Amino acid sequence: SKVYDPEQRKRMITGPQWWARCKQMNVLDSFINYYDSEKHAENAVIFLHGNATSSYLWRHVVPHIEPVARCIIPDLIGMGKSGKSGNGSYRLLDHYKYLTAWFELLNLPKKIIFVGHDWGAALAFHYAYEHQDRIKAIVHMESVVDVIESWDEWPDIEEDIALIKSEEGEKMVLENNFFVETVLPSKIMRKLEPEEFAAYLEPFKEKGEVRRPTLSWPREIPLVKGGKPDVVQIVRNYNAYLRASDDLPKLFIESDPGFFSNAIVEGAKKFPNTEFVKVKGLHFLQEDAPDEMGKYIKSFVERVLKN
């Protein structure tokens, strides 16, 4: 960059710059690429991206939080610079298998903090449900909070999911990279620098099966009518648990104007002990308000740990 460039270019962290700061660890039959701030390891804040993205999504958020707790940020299996799944499956429970095996190797404390976006939040919530004594706090945003029914902003959701579950949906993703090349830039308000978009494109630059995780994620959607039954049960279970979790501090980060935020905020409001903040964004809000997000999370984590 040069001094005369826009601020977003002067602040840019490229893919190679981010990847050089990551570590790799063998996990089961594969490996996970991840960022680990290491210091302040008495707590661990695990940041989980969702569809289309990777640990790179959090690169401008994490600097704010590192000074108060160890921050650990994986590329989910099949995504970013992580290895692939050994049986070629990329369902929620495949991701959960690798995530939990990875946790066992990280020297974590008994109670951890999650920061989840999109399907990353679903992984956090399911982990919490299954390990209710291992959760200190949860931050969530644009998240899978509950089972899903057609609603006012999206009246034909069943039909759109039918499309994504069809062969034409498969073409849209595996052939045309729909989620990375179309949806991702559309749901960030700002312009990504070429190198920033390149970091998201890189894992999925080739046509075909390498793009499978970006097709598999939306096919997991917990629709009340048509949802995968294992995911529907997982979400029903963790939703009931979260509604009753009076002693579990939560932070919900709403995007303004948002994508899923307006439809899911009422769902998020059903969880007790939730602090609510709002930042600029559509779906990938980390790209539109990373500093505000990082500061709100830092403050929340500090107060959770003090109280």
Nearest Cα residue to 248 out of 165, 139, 154 = 139
Beta bridge partners of 275: 251
Residue positions annotated with a catalytic role: 51, 118-119, 142, 283
* Residue boundaries of the structural domains of the chain: 1-307
Measuring CA to CA, how many Å separate 11 from each of 67, 152, 193, 195?
Answer: 20, 39, 11, 12
What is the distance between the alpha carbons of residues 142 and 51, in angstroms, rounded to a whole number?
11
Measuring CA to CA, how many Å separate 295 from each of 36, 61, 235, 290?
Answer: 19, 8, 29, 9
Residue ranges in the chain assigned as alpha helix (H): 7-10, 15-20, 92-103, 119-130, 157-165, 167-170, 184-186, 194-201, 212-219, 229-243, 261-268, 290-306
Which contacts of 230-233 are long-range, i.e. CB under 8 A and separated by 24 or more positions?
A: 230/91, 230/92, 230/93, 231/91, 231/92, 232/147
CATH topology for the 1-307 domain? Rossmann fold (3.40.50)
Cis peptide upstream of residue 63 (ω within 30 degrees of 0) = no
Kindly tell me the burial class for residue 198, based on how many C-beta atoms sit within 10 Å of its own C-beta (0-12, 13-18, 19 or more). Answer: middle
DSSP calls for 174-194: IIT-IIIIIIHHHT-SSPPPH
For helices 229-243 and 92-103, angle between their N-to-C axes, nearest 10 degrees? 60
**Is 160 annotated in some ligand binding site?**
yes
What is the distance between the alpha carbons of residues 87 and 89, in angstroms, rounded to a whole number?
6
